[PDB]
Each structure stands twice: as structure tokens, then as C-alpha cells.
Amino acid sequence: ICVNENGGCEQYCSDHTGTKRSCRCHEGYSLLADGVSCTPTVEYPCGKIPILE
Amino acid sequence: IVGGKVCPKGECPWQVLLLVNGAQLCGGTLINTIWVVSAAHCFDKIKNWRNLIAVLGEHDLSEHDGDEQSRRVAQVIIPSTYVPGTTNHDIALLRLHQPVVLTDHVVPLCLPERTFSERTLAFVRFSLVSGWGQLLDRGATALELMVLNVPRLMTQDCLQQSRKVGDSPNITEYMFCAGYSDGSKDSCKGDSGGPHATHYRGTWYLTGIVSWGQGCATVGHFGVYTRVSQYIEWLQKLMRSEPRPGVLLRAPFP
Ligand SMILES: CCOc1cc(OCC)c(F)c([C@@H](Nc2ccc(C(=N)N)c(O)c2)C(=O)NS(=O)(=O)c2cccc(N)c2)c1
Ligand SMILES: [Ca+2]
Ligand SMILES: [Ca+2]
């Protein structure tokens, strides 16, 4: 259920049936094996502030 | 920005400064290396598109520190539904002539998927709005980039909490209210086109565009922003298209 708590996804969420869902990440990020987390794959991924990171 | 504070240099890396003949025109948001989102009304009075410049990595307008990157604007795309002089569909997609180089001071804001933005981001109460606009209604503009945290209101609540005006333009589904009604904090005219950025689980996303208001930080009123989620598909399709001759392009919306 993507509508509730973002389906548990850190970023994007897609519902497949009433019991199946896939999380996805923006370009510049990759989904971790937990199936919900996104980790940067580039030096300057969108939406992150380098000096604070 | 009225009632906010200086955005520490580098902490608002997606902020864009648009200039016409060297003069401050509006703000904008970098969403990738060659695309910037701004407000359509920022271009109502352009006579010669070749005088339009976008600056990234900007912070202090009084000095050059080497982090600034300026680019000519190759294309300004506006929804077919936008009518100059009116408030609805206030969004513009700009293609830079050359991509900017991402650095600690130049980073794009994430353009979210429509579902994520409607189902999740729309419920994050506070978001940041920024720009070099007026520090006070009818006051001087800022020399350093300013930023302000503003809470979002459901439209029903915005209308109920706002004082009624005769000629007041309608708040459509392509807009949303954010701010305060005590006359202390709001974005302003010179911030037009700038970002309304929303944080979610460690990442920032574009949810709004500084669009309009009945004065800046007017008691009884809120700032009004373009509801970016309505345009995600429209923007994504355009970014996948080849550039066309002639700077201004009116593209079908939806
Ligand atoms: C689509 C833009 O429509 C407007 C309407 C406004 O008043 C309506 C009664 C308004 F003050 C602004 C204003 N932007 C703005 C931005 C933010 C605020 C704010 N209080 N947060 C706010 O109070 C105002 C603006 O840009 N005015 S303008 O003269 O430079 C201009 C240029 C080109 C087209 C238009 N429409 C306006 C723009
Ligand atoms: Ca500077
Ligand atoms: Ca480059």
C-alpha cells in the first residue's frame, strides 16, 4: 500500500496487486536489498546537500 | 523572502538566479544538469530572449567567488493553458544552452514522481522557499540568498483562514497555499519562480514554485505556489524531446 506510509519506501512506490509492491529510486541512486532504501551511485545525487553530507 | 534568514552558502545548491540584461528577474530550480523549473509569469515581458541568463552556485550578489556558473537559456517552455497576466498554470521549463557542472555548490533538486508527491510529499507540513527577493513588502531585495520554512495548507483551509478580497484570483487545483497569516513570513515578488522544496527521509524534492500573493506577508493572507505535482508528466515528456528552433515554446497541457 503505497498510499500508507509511502509503502515503506524511502523514495518511489508502485502497487502491483493488493499484496505486492515495488519501491524504486531516482536516477543517481540504487535500491538496497531491503527493497526500500536508496543509496547514491554518483557524487552529486539530486536532493542532497554536499556540505551537510 | 520576508522573515527568513540567509541560506548558508551551499545549503540551497539547486537555487537558480535568472537575469535579463544583467538585472535580477526571478528565481528558478535546477532539476538536472541542463533543466531548470521556474514560473511562466517571469517571462511575460521578455522582448529579446538572448538577454536571459541563468546563474547557478550564486550566493552573494555583491561579490564573485568562483562558484557561480552562468548559462544562456536555449529554450523556455510554457503550458498552452497559461495566459499572460493571469495566475493559473504558472510554470516554465527552461533548457540551458550548456549543462552546468555539478559541484558542492551546484546540485539539482529531485523532481518527484507524481504519485509520490501526491500521496506523500503533499502531507509533509513544512518546506523551504528561497530567493533574493524583497526582504519586506515594498522593501529592498536581498544581497544574500534567503530561505524560509513555511507550512502548507489544504486549499479549503487556506480559503477559510484567508480574508476575502473582491478582485482576488481563485486558488485552483494547480496551486497551493503555504505560509503564515500574521504578516511575519512569506516569499515575495522577486522570489517568483524559486523553489518550494520538501524534505522526505533524507532527500529534498521540488513541490512548488513561488507564484503569487495578495501582497507579501499581508496579514490575513498566505503565499500561493504552483502545485508542481500536476506537471510531472508534462515536464518529463518535454525533457525527453529534442530542442526546437526559437526560444519560447508553448507546449500542450496536459
Ligand atoms: C502568476 C503571477 O501572478 C501574480 C499576481 C500578483 O498579484 C495578484 C493580485 C503578484 F503580486 C505577483 C508577483 N509575484 C509574487 C510572488 C509571491 C508572492 C507572495 N506573497 N508569496 C507575492 O505577493 C507576489 C509578481 O511577480 N508581480 S509582477 O508585477 O512582477 C508580475 C510580472 C508578470 C506577470 C504578473 N502577473 C505579475 C504575481
Ligand atoms: Ca556571487
Ligand atoms: Ca559538463
For chain A, the three-class secondary structure string (H helix, E strand, C coil) is CCCCHHHHCCCEEEECCCCCEEEECCCCEEECCCCCCEEECCCCCCCCCCCCC
All domains of chain B in start order, with CATH:
1-12+109-229 (2.40.10.10), 13-108+230-243 (2.40.10.10)
Contact B29, B16 (CB under 8 A): yes
Contact B4, B148 (CB under 8 A): yes
Q: Is B215 in the pocket of ligand 1 (CB under 6 A)?
A: yes
Q: Is B214 in the pocket of ligand 1 (CB under 6 A)?
A: yes
* Domain containing residue A40: 1-53
Cis check: omega of the bond before B254, within 30 degrees of 0 = yes
- Written in H, E and C, the secondary structure of chain B is CECCEECCCCCCCCEEEEEECCEEEEEEEECCCCEEEECHHHHCCCCCHHHEEEEECCCECCCCCCCCEEEEEEEEEEECCCCCCCCCCCCEEEEECCCCCCECCECCCECCCHHHHHHCHHHCCEEEEEECCECCCCCCECCECEEEEEEEECHHHHHHHCCCCCCCCCCCCCEEEECCCCCCCECCHHHCCCEEEEEECCEEEEEEEEEECCCCCCCCCCEEEEEHHHHHHHHHHHHCCCCCCCCEEEECCC
Question: d(Cα B73, Cα A35) in Å, to the nearest integer?
Answer: 40
Q: Is B33 in the pocket of ligand 1 (CB under 6 A)?
A: no
Query: A28: alpha, beta or left, given left = phi > 0 and alpha = psi -120 to 50?
Result: left
CATH of the domain at A2: 2.10.25.10
Residue B201: what are its φ and ψ, rounded to 5°?
A: 50, 50
What determination technique applies here? X-ray
Question: d(Cα B176, Cα B187) in Å, to the nearest integer?
Answer: 14
Contact B1, B188 (CB under 8 A): yes
Q: In this structure, what C-alpha cell is assigned to residue A10?
A: 524511502
Say whether B130 is catalytic. Answer: no
What's the alpha-carbon Rg for chain A, to the nearest Å? 12
Contact B211, B39 (CB under 8 A): yes
Of B105, B5, B112, B111, which is closest to residue B55 (Cα–Cα)?
Answer: B105
Question: d(Cα B146, Cα B134) in Å, to the nearest integer?
Answer: 10
Is A53 an interface residue toward B (CB < 8 Å)? no
Is A10 an interface residue toward B (CB < 8 Å)? yes
Contact B65, B29 (CB under 8 A): no
Candidate from B102, B104, B109 with C-beta closest to A47: B109
- The count of structural domains within chain A is 1
Cα-Cα-Cα-Cα dihedral of B156, B161, B166, B168, to 10°?
A: -60
Say whether B41 is catalytic. Answer: yes
Query: Do A50 and B107 make contact, defined as CB atoms within 8 angstroms?
Result: yes
What burial letters (b/e) apply to B178-196, b meaning 16+ CB within 10 Å?
Answer: bbbbebebbbbbbbbbbbb
Which residue matches cell numbers 497555499? B177
Tally A–B CB contacts below 8 A.
Answer: 64
Ligand 1 centre distance from Cα of residue B12 (Å):
23
Whether residue B137 is annotated as binding a ligand: the answer is no
Q: In this structure, what C-alpha cell is assigned to residue B28?
A: 528558478
Query: Do B119 and A48 make contact, defined as CB atoms within 8 angstroms?
Result: no
Say whether B90 is catalytic. Answer: yes
Contact B29, B194 (CB under 8 A): yes
